[PDB]
């Protein structure tokens, strides 16, 4: 059984583990840290892609595009603080009214 399955997560906890090892942040790593980080990343990804899917519903098409993503990220006022520095590829810019 996989670590992601035992956690109930979809994301690769083992990959996050090995990447923490690659990123040389600290020599000793708690075993709970990679799973916690993977859960956080999965939550953030799920939230942003759900917002993008609802934006696609607003645009009346069944495939996510960078415009949907940019609109969602700019409109959500908390994720706009989280990614205030980011500008999206083929994402555009939001209207004045």
């Amino acid at each position: 059984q996989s670590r992601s399955a035992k956690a109930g997560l979809t994301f690769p906890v083992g990959r996050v583990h090995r990447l923490l090892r690659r990123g040389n942040y600290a020599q000793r790593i708690g075993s709970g840290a990679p799973v916690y980080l993977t859960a956080v990343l999965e939550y953030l990804a799920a939230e942003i892609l759900e917002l993008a899917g609802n934006a696609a519903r607003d645009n009346k098409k069944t495939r996510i595009i960078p415009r949907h993503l940019q609109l969602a990220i700019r409109n959500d006022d908390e994720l706009n603080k989280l990614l205030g520095n980011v500008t999206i590829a083929q994402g555009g810019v939001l209207p004045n009214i």
Partner: protein
């Protein structure tokens, strides 16, 4: 030659299947969301281990990651993030 490139695209698509089963993803959008998780991973891990160095403690651990996420995320998202991290690690430790 070309080495195999790391990606989370399969997991992103699977969680989109869970959310909206009828919806697909464009290639540019998929690259965008693949970059999302790596960017977040870095800006969490660097801050967390810097905080560990401030503690002058050897181990980066769950408390360090929890503090790092709640530091850097905006608060409204931070509450959800810490709750989900805590419940996920609890579910794991219950194995």
């Amino acid at each position: 030659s070309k080495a195999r490139k790391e990606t989370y695209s399969s997991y992103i698509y699977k969680v989109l299947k869970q959310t909206h089963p009828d919806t697909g993803i464009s290639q540019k959008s998929m690259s965008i969301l693949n970059s999302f998780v790596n960017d977040i991973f870095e800006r969490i891990a660097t801050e967390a281990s810097k905080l560990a160095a401030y503690n002058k403690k050897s181990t980066i651990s769950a408390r360090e990651i929890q503090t790092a996420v709640r530091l850097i995320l905006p608060g409204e998202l931070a509450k959800h993030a810490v709750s989900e991290g805590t419940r996920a690690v609890t579910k794991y430790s219950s194995s």
